[PDB]
Amino acid sequence: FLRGITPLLERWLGNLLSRQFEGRHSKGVAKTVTKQRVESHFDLELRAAVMHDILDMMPDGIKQNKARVILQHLSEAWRCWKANIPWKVPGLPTPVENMILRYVKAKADWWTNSAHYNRERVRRGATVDKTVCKKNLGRLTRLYLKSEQERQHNYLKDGPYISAEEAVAIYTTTVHWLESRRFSPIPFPPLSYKHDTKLLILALERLKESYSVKNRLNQSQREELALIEQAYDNPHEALSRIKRHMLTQRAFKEVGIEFMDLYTHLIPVYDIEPLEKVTDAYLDQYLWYEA
Amino acid sequence: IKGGVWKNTEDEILKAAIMKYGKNQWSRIASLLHRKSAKQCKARWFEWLDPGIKKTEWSREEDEKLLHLAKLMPTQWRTIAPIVGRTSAQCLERYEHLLDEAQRKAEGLDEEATETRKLKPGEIDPTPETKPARPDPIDMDDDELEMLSEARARLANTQGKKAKRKARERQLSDARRLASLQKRREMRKPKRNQIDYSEEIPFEKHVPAGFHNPSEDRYVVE
Amino acid sequence: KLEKIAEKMDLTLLNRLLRLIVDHNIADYMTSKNNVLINYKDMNHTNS
């Protein structure tokens, strides 16, 4: 042991002594780039390359202060890519714009390609850092929606992917089925239906159970609990609202989306507005009972 | 409790907040108001308060597209809406209003305009963001004056925690500084980590030699 | 696996099928409720 530890300590105690006598010269030693520091270092070298392209591209005789504004346009062009907003600056010079667009696509490609690489680590199990997983889920959530917005736009542009032939084929098929089954179609919940408060109470407990399993509550969860308690205290008022919604509204508040991070595959999760969930939950209960 | 009906004071606080904090940080906006959530402030903007939301009267090409789309896209009121260029609430209540005209025209259209459908029954709106605000009352009260005062304050309180706290050392000391300088004025610390720049010319770059003898210049000090 | 069933079902076709088995006011509520603004973070689009 001492054979090999002798030169190691000779070096180490030398370094200890030398900084103890000479002082520590180490100001301006090159800091290397490591795990957390990569993403800030990419932004340094991007902005430096962008700036060098700006100054070479502008002709001789221009006030250079314009260059720092161009770096702002770059940052906005990235955020619009990230958030899938279409970016267009109306007066921006076309060499400046075309230069910006290239760097945004380089940042883009690096950003998505690192999302893919990190997810293979999370699938394989080569990473155990919760911040990397939580970061990467954010990237993949954006990359999903970025393609889902394409898919929803393409539908209106490309039209119904199902032909009118196929659609009438499946429609008539269910008529011939349900006719031969003598299926009596589900009526609208009568104004004095015998079962309503039981189906409602079943709906409420399916909603309330999701909060027994949680230690903390926030403003959207609190308002749901208030609605559940109000529905318990005056169910004939709750049922009056619920039935009125199905007759008299067709425009609904926006649905938030989130993803649930099972390491092999993400599941999409939606939060419907609490006042609407109580109506869907009764209807869900009503539909399945009647069916 | 959240939301309620909108008040004209709230809409203009929202306008001021939007035209400062920017059109997509609604939580920073909603903490300026009471009663509303960020989602309700966001909804209030795009669904009715935003400029360009086309609150002019409807016209027969709009109605044609509305009735054309309502056949092609039954119930898809968020997809119909871009194509008519109107908000989904406008599309739907117009469509319902046009059916109300078409349904009363079955028979007794004059009394059938009047004896029921003249107004909603006074139930709470499921989204009053779609509706014009209540005008502000003839005089203000605590629920509005407080948020107005807090709104007015925050709208230019742009100093951060660091700047707000430590800049106070100027005012709290400088009077006392002049008073402690007043001891110097009336009773009458070492530094060594750096050169005193007033002792000798720092890092003096001497002027190069040139063809004109500089010592012919005689300068008189000010 | 009947892949992408929920992703690909056309709401106009779904509505017509729902019109068969249930009252049209419910079937119109159901399909309209599928047709709503999706939101995450600063990203928004209509589910069509």
Partner: peptide, 29 residues
């Protein structure tokens, strides 16, 4: 537009095909 309003109310607010009953008539638009 009232012609097509009356036309599509025969398409929308009818009871279901599985009930039978006579079709509402429509108009040529």
């Amino acid at each position: 537009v009232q012609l097509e309003l009356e036309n599509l109310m025969a398409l929308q607010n009818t009871e279901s095909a599985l009930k039978g009953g006579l079709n509402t008539p429509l108009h040529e638009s």
